[PDB]
Amino acid sequence: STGSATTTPIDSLDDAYITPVQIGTPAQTLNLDFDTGSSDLWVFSSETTASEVDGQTIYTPSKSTTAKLLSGATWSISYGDGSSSSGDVYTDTVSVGGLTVTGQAVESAKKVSSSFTEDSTIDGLLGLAFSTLNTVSPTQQKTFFDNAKASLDSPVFTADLGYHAPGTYNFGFIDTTAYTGSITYTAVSTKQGFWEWTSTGYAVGSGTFKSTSIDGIADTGTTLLYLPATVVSAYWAQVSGAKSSSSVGGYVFPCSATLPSFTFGVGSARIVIPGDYIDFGPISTGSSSCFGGIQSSAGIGINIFGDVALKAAFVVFNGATTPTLGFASK
């Protein structure tokens, strides 16, 4: 089997992407944030504290003839950005782009943090990291991909995120028309539960490539590119007037600037992030200070190849017995 679904930016900055997902019988379609940095499929629901729901579409398990309470199971998750959610668990039928999994754990939120409430466009998350990170207790549950894997034509999914435009998540096949040149594959460590890999270096604009190992995670659920402070300083030093602002929470730059590109290495291959992908616009409405899309990972504890990086590539998440990651230009 295979599946193919369009993923759409939630706003004009590509702060996140939503993908429609069918849950239950009859189908209830929710728009979920596919997150290769976590491993829970959780939704706003009829059980979510009423004051914490503000415009989201909810899953109502009592209206699904295939929903079953997973007795005694609870979940609770905290994300890198400080947001969180928790609740209980149902199993139900879940379909993405024509690919159906029966008996998928659907984690129903009883509580969500303010950042989730305030984002009316995201109805929940669909985790695509390794199932070892799933938070369901006392019986850990499998991700949608892990459940689908054996049925897929090939045990892979791909992320093709757009810049200020829709893109595609495919399951079970590689669309050879969706990228240019060849796909370069690189080793993955699953030791921390992430799609963790080592970039071979970077360049700023038309500058020379610096060969240096940068360990990090491919994370579709993180907006920006978080890299070591040395790398990030070298980038912003090429933008007149750019500075790190502790009050704002990162590097800012004059909105009048033209940003240089940023290149990262994948083995001997190179992925080029155009300068415009690094512009996240005014820090507040009407400001001439703009927020940068490349930020320091210092004090995160891990480097994160988030959407800024991934949307410059066609990315293969290869879930074979020995997982790997592939990157192509597009």
Swiss-Prot record:
Q: Name one GO molecular function term.
A: aspartic-type endopeptidase activity
Domain Peptidase A1: start-end pairs: 17-328
What is the species of this protein? Cryphonectria parasitica (Chestnut blight fungus)
- The reply to whether Cell cycle figures as a keyword in the UniProt entry is no
**What positions constitute the catalytic site?**
D35, S199
Top enzyme class, one word, equals: hydrolase
Question: Keywords in UniProt for this one?
Answer: Aspartyl protease, Disulfide bond, Hydrolase, Protease, Signal, Zymogen
Give the UniProt family note: Belongs to the peptidase A1 family.
Q: What is its EC number?
A: 3.4.23.22
Q: Which cysteines bridge via disulfide bonds?
A: C255-C290
Q: Which reaction does it catalyse?
A: Hydrolysis of proteins with specificity similar to that of pepsin A, prefers hydrophobic residues at P1 and P1', but does not cleave 14-Ala-|-Leu-15 in the B chain of insulin or Z-Glu-Tyr. Clots milk
Protein name, per record: Endothiapepsin
Its BP terms in the Gene Ontology are: proteolysis
Give the gene symbol: EAPA
Asked whether the keyword Signal is assigned, the reply is yes
